[PDB]
Design an enzyme around this catalytic site. Sequence first.
Site, PDB file in Angstrom:
ATOM      1  N   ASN A   8      -4.530  -6.096   4.276  1.00 41.63           N
ATOM      2  CA  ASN A   8      -4.076  -6.484   3.283  1.00 41.63           C
ATOM      3  C   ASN A   8      -4.590  -7.561   2.669  1.00 41.63           C
ATOM      4  O   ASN A   8      -4.001  -8.729   2.989  1.00 41.63           O
ATOM      5  CB  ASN A   8      -2.715  -6.057   3.668  1.00 41.63           C
ATOM      6  CG  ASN A   8      -1.885  -6.276   2.223  1.00 41.63           C
ATOM      7  OD1 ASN A   8      -1.745  -6.605   0.844  1.00 41.63           O
ATOM      8  ND2 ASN A   8      -0.451  -5.372   2.157  1.00 41.63           N
ATOM      9  N   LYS A  10      -3.142  -9.231  -0.620  1.00 38.01           N
ATOM     10  CA  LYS A  10      -1.770  -9.756  -0.280  1.00 38.01           C
ATOM     11  C   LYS A  10      -3.190 -10.505  -1.815  1.00 38.01           C
ATOM     12  O   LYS A  10      -3.200 -10.195  -2.731  1.00 38.01           O
ATOM     13  CB  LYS A  10      -1.583 -10.495   0.661  1.00 38.01           C
ATOM     14  CG  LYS A  10      -0.879  -9.230   0.725  1.00 38.01           C
ATOM     15  CD  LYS A  10       0.177 -10.517   2.231  1.00 38.01           C
ATOM     16  CE  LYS A  10       0.761  -9.428   3.291  1.00 38.01           C
ATOM     17  NZ  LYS A  10       1.599  -9.926   4.208  1.00 38.01           N
ATOM     18  N   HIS A  92       5.238  -1.853   0.175  1.00 43.73           N
ATOM     19  CA  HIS A  92       5.392  -2.692   1.291  1.00 43.73           C
ATOM     20  C   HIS A  92       6.325  -3.759   1.308  1.00 43.73           C
ATOM     21  O   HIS A  92       7.355  -3.605  -0.139  1.00 43.73           O
ATOM     22  CB  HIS A  92       4.047  -3.495   0.577  1.00 43.73           C
ATOM     23  CG  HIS A  92       3.815  -4.947   1.800  1.00 43.73           C
ATOM     24  ND1 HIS A  92       4.603  -5.797   1.679  1.00 43.73           N
ATOM     25  CD2 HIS A  92       2.920  -4.668   2.497  1.00 43.73           C
ATOM     26  CE1 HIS A  92       3.524  -6.362   3.118  1.00 43.73           C
ATOM     27  NE2 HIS A  92       2.673  -5.794   3.440  1.00 43.73           N
ATOM     28  N   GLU A  94       7.092  -6.925   0.609  1.00 50.11           N
ATOM     29  CA  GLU A  94       7.045  -7.576  -0.295  1.00 50.11           C
ATOM     30  C   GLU A  94       7.413  -7.346  -1.563  1.00 50.11           C
ATOM     31  O   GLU A  94       8.581  -6.974  -2.131  1.00 50.11           O
ATOM     32  CB  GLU A  94       5.763  -7.746   0.069  1.00 50.11           C
ATOM     33  CG  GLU A  94       5.424  -9.807   1.021  1.00 50.11           C
ATOM     34  CD  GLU A  94       4.405  -9.288   1.595  1.00 50.11           C
ATOM     35  OE1 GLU A  94       3.276  -8.899   0.668  1.00 50.11           O
ATOM     36  OE2 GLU A  94       3.986  -9.972   2.580  1.00 50.11           O
ATOM     37  N   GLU A 162       5.970  -2.207   9.742  1.00 54.92           N
ATOM     38  CA  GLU A 162       6.013  -3.070   9.376  1.00 54.92           C
ATOM     39  C   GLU A 162       7.338  -3.752   9.271  1.00 54.92           C
ATOM     40  O   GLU A 162       8.261  -4.078   8.149  1.00 54.92           O
ATOM     41  CB  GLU A 162       5.388  -3.615   8.278  1.00 54.92           C
ATOM     42  CG  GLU A 162       4.182  -2.915   8.044  1.00 54.92           C
ATOM     43  CD  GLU A 162       2.956  -3.424   6.545  1.00 54.92           C
ATOM     44  OE1 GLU A 162       3.547  -3.621   5.560  1.00 54.92           O
ATOM     45  OE2 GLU A 162       2.116  -3.634   7.004  1.00 54.92           O
ATOM     46  N   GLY A 168       3.710 -12.392   7.870  1.00 58.54           N
ATOM     47  CA  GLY A 168       3.697 -13.694   7.999  1.00 58.54           C
ATOM     48  C   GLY A 168       4.087 -14.837   8.864  1.00 58.54           C
ATOM     49  O   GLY A 168       3.794 -15.781   8.403  1.00 58.54           O
ATOM     50  N   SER A 208       2.130  -9.950  11.598  1.00 55.55           N
ATOM     51  CA  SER A 208       0.960 -11.303  12.352  1.00 55.55           C
ATOM     52  C   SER A 208       0.245  -9.838  13.472  1.00 55.55           C
ATOM     53  O   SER A 208       0.040 -10.898  14.605  1.00 55.55           O
ATOM     54  CB  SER A 208       2.100 -11.935  12.990  1.00 55.55           C
ATOM     55  OG  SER A 208       3.009 -12.606  11.686  1.00 55.55           O
TER      56      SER A 208
END
Lengths: 245, 245
Positions: A8, A10, A92, A94, A162, A168, A208
């Site tokens: 990904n 991003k 996702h 986000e 996730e 992150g 991560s």
Amino acid sequence: RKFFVGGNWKMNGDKKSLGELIHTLNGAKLSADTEVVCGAPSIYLDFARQKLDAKIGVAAQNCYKVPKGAFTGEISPAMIKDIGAAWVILGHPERRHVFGESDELIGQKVAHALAEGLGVIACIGEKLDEREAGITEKVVFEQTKAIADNVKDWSKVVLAYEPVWAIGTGKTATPQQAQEVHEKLRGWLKTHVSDAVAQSTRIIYGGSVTGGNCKELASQHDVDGFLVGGASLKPEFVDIINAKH
Amino acid sequence: RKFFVGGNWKMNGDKKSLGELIHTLNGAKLSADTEVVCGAPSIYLDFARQKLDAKIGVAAQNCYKVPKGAFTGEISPAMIKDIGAAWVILGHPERRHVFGESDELIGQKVAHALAEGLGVIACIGEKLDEREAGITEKVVFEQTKAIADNVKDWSKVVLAYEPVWAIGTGKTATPQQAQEVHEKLRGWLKTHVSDAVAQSTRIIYGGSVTGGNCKELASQHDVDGFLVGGASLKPEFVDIINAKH
């Protein structure tokens, strides 16, 4: 279940540095046993499909729920397929927590993307407060129900666990934490869809994943791969691809 | 003050049909006194800039507020400049009412896009239940203030009044209606920013502009052009461009 790792990217890159990263992936020894897909920003989906070796898949980071229409700033499954990408990442964290996409809406996006013939990497994940409150299993079953309800043919869906507290931050899920929910998800799928869907659907982990921790995560039985964020911009993405070897 | 026609393709098109369209624009006798831009899907911006004639601007239909990061699904001013596009459309009505973009977000994206050296076509527009309640002027001044407070340099800002009751409905504003709120806007500018800014700033109208009603709206004194949607996907766009003809 073929090992799957998606990168990904991003909201990163420019044409210079993504041409550089793609030249590394193309010329690298990548395991024939791993399915690899890169999720470029929509503005470089075409250029990434033109530069990446055909055996590497291209995924879109988001898409809307109808082929066309008055939705300034969106793109549809039809445009993604036109550029020659075969995948779309939906749900996702986000998009859920920063941009407010609901389960209802992820759900209709999944159904529209599959009807259009794309593959779907569908992402589920609990927040830290939900894990500390102990309700990880309720949250993630609710989220894959909202997805599964919109899934006709599971051969084109990859589920991605996730947990939000690991995206992150540097705080990876331990291999035992990842394993436990991945076999619960596999359980959910065996009770609610079928044993055959449960045994062939890849459930991948994200949050991560690095070159230095991937090998121990891939040794777990129900972890079928990764969806790599920050480290997919780096040379060690080749090592993550090669985590089982 | 240069007449400005923007074409907002919204979520429509593919490479074959935008390819047909772009070939017409490059072939058309377009006025010398109009600045034209086309607002292409993120997925086709590089294609649209490669293929369109250099005199015709390309605009992105949205962007986010930082240059890079962990925002799956977004593209940044850096990436848009990288591709050669010179403008971004921010705060379009569909983004505010279908996708929840508040004035605080639009205001932060305007300042970022401007800091990165892009042009902004900043959108404002009241709803019908607000027009009928007699508060158009307080709504559009509220909206314009959320943008103006985030603008250090006006030479690269185009304001687009887009009453939401007129977008894709066919219910276009009468020339008198467009003119009342555009001269109100201009005056707001001269009293809360400055005379040279008010003199200079293009204020354009969008909301069911066709080649049929465009010369009347364009003859209004404070209408500096249009941001056209559905009609910009048709040969008709060439008439709207040339509309003081």
